[PDB]
Symmetry: D2
Subunit: 249 residues, 4 copies
């Protein structure tokens, strides 16, 4: 019975309700942002999230993202910043995670993010140690805070527990807290607590998001290198693939 896709009705009710929730929270969601790419399921074996549904509280890797901005910010840059432009830019999006579900372990080589919880609470799991990039020196300034150890009893997705091993630091964010920064080159993941009465709704403000997705394939590249450039490295292999497209039957 292992689900291999999500029905059109399951997808629409999930995404359309989330868009309404976002609008209720005053996030500027336009019509084009509500599409078949908004609802993400990280891997075929994660489609089972819909066996019992988004309110089951079960641990699965899936989420909704409504992106209001992803500005290259290339205009006005001295030509010499061409090779480093990919680390800048501005991406603003609203992310919705239901109870128990996760935005799976992953890291970005270029994108640095920041979180602002709007509704619910966000449990962030991450490695305070930055990853290295063979052959290249890297700058340091603030680095990541050590945080706290994981709380007891966190249910991880079946068959993906190991992908979380290195994300030893934990922090729980709430509405009204100071903005939290997730520096690039740091493994991170997050979920909405299983007992939450509401979906987790978080506003992410980060640098440009390099994603050669389906709802992406068609735009013009600001800088040659950017074309087909990917910057979302998921720890679990089964997550990097099913991420670029949602199977809707």
């Amino acid at each position: 019975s292992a689900r291999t896709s999500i029905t059109r009705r399951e997808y629409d009710e999930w995404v359309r309700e989330a868009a309404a929730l976002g609008k209720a929270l005053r996030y500027p969601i336009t019509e084009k942002m509500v599409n078949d790419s908004a609802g993400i399921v990280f891997g075929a074996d994660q489609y089972d999230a819909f066996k019992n549904g988004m309110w089951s509280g079960e641990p699965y890797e899936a989420m909704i993202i409504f992106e209001s901005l992803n500005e290259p910010a290339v205009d006005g840059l001295p030509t010499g910043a061409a090779p480093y432009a990919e680390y800048s830019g501005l991406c603003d999006k609203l992310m919705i995670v239901h109870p128990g579900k996760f935005c799976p372990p992953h890291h970005h080589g270029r994108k640095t993010e920041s979180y602002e919880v709007v509704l619910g609470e966000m449990e962030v799991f991450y490695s305070p140690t930055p990853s290295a990039e063979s052959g290249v020196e890297l700058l340091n300034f603030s680095g990541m805070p050590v945080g706290s150890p994981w709380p007891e009893g966190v249910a991880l997705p079946k068959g993906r527990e190991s992908s979380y091993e290195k994300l030893t630091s934990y922090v729980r964010l709430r509405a009204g807290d100071p903005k939290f920064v997730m520096h690039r080159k740091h493994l991170h993941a997050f979920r909405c607590p299983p007992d939450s009465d509401v979906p987790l709704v978080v506003r992410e403000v980060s640098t440009y998001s390099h994603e050669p997705t389906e709802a992406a394939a068609g735009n013009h590249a600001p800088i040659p290198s950017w074309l087909g450039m990917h910057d979302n490295d998921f720890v679990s292999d089964a997550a990097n693939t099913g991420r670029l497209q949602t199977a809707i039957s």
Copy 2:
């Protein structure tokens, strides 16, 4: 009678009410963000805004800014991006402009901004033509849209009308609109309409904001060059000075 400062009571009621308005709108305002640097008056001759008050509807250059984030985003960058890092980073802030008042004509060589109106309506005045930087070539991708001509009857601040001459393009932004981008090296200004029943409240998401201000003098510089680096170029000379400090008696 030309006011030369703002009284402690005038300042607190202006800034504390604005902070409450921001909180009502769910913007994450922390205690340290509500300080004596939040309320800005651009020039001694602009203190007359307080002769009749922030609800007079009169044209003056003053505003409130609550900055929740100003992240250098230097961590994880290849050492080669050191000289171009100043063009990136992440700055999130809530700006409050009362009826008739303006965020005066100015431009940034490094900072690219984006606007999201939360409450009220925002009238943006800008030059669709980017400024040049002697001796350096610059990248181009999207540039700025031409916009529309100014609507009839815009009252400008007395003695500062000329600073607006080059900002020929106009656009009126409302809550729910697509995010609007103001590329770096473009002259821009904005105001809250004089007949607005509410202050204009806008969320700005931009690259790092280089400002060697009073509430700034004391931090550590992520990159040597950044120290004392200024990136807010106001057209009116009387605006670049009184911007770094508010005279409260």
Copy 3:
């Protein structure tokens, strides 16, 4: 295939998402308010609303109601008001209607309501003529406004079109409008437009709501007569029954 009930999963996702939407809108929803009585389906033949779902846009009679208050307001009343107390009291509730769905034609002999749209838009259908009560004289003061004729093309629920015949007046309410009053003894109904991108969310402030429901059977009666007193008269017979309980399988 005519549905005869709603599955536990269908019910929970419908009601739990609505509760989250309400909370997003700051309505004070407590845990006990989110129960198996919140989601209402007016008649067995209306369960087909779940054949295609709450986002199908199809015309069916069903809605969600989260009641925060239903105060008899009997305390402090002179004993002589005992027989007229049933016309007073205070009932505050949040009602959520999905696109195309209706709160079916009905009237109350005692309850006078008022509407405040919080999200979406509300299309109210009603009779400007008050109903009569055989043998009893009634007071008049403001009466109901005549309103406008129905807009063209309103899709009514299959097999229930006639129940709307007498509700000739129409009015479309939006967020920010003046409070709208629906005097007792007036036939009324309302729906969320089929093309709405969001569920209709309305705050109703009315006099006491006499409803001997399932989630009601168990309380103490403030005044003898009130016991088992019903005040929700639906035009369609198939609506008065299936209203007191939702079949969840």
Copy 4:
């Protein structure tokens, strides 16, 4: 220097900012609701609240009220309820109280209220004992909860401390709490804590509010008796007078 009035500028900034705060919180405030009757000062000696201002945190009796509804609910009533109609009706309003300020001790013979905190926190002081009405028997059902004793260190307005003596019960209400009912014939008062970073904003849903005020003198009476009927009995004599009008110079 004892202030004897409030200047036009002081009044407008106080009331216009409050209206904007209300709108930010989605309360349906129309243009006519923002008038010279919205800002209330209970007594000439309370005008000193403006010596240091609404953010001084000092104890004074003053508040702002934006009434969206005050429906007699007389239509549809059997003629026999004419003498008891004054106890019913529907009044919806948003009340704004700044830090340290109070809605002074008082009681209503007819009006029963309910509170829903929208922003900030509300400290309610009241007598759990209902007042008696010479010669008339009264109904009882739920009565008022006993509550808790006052917290230590509540600063009361100078010269009005005694008016609070009988309001022995205390309860602190927050956003999201169950609706709180204040039965008619109970002495009550409330304030916004002095250390609050935001004004207290509360939505009150009560029965009809009988107030022959300035912004009232001119309407038609639904029932003869109602004409000139007053239902706001303040413990302090200096409060019952200056309540019907605000001295603006």
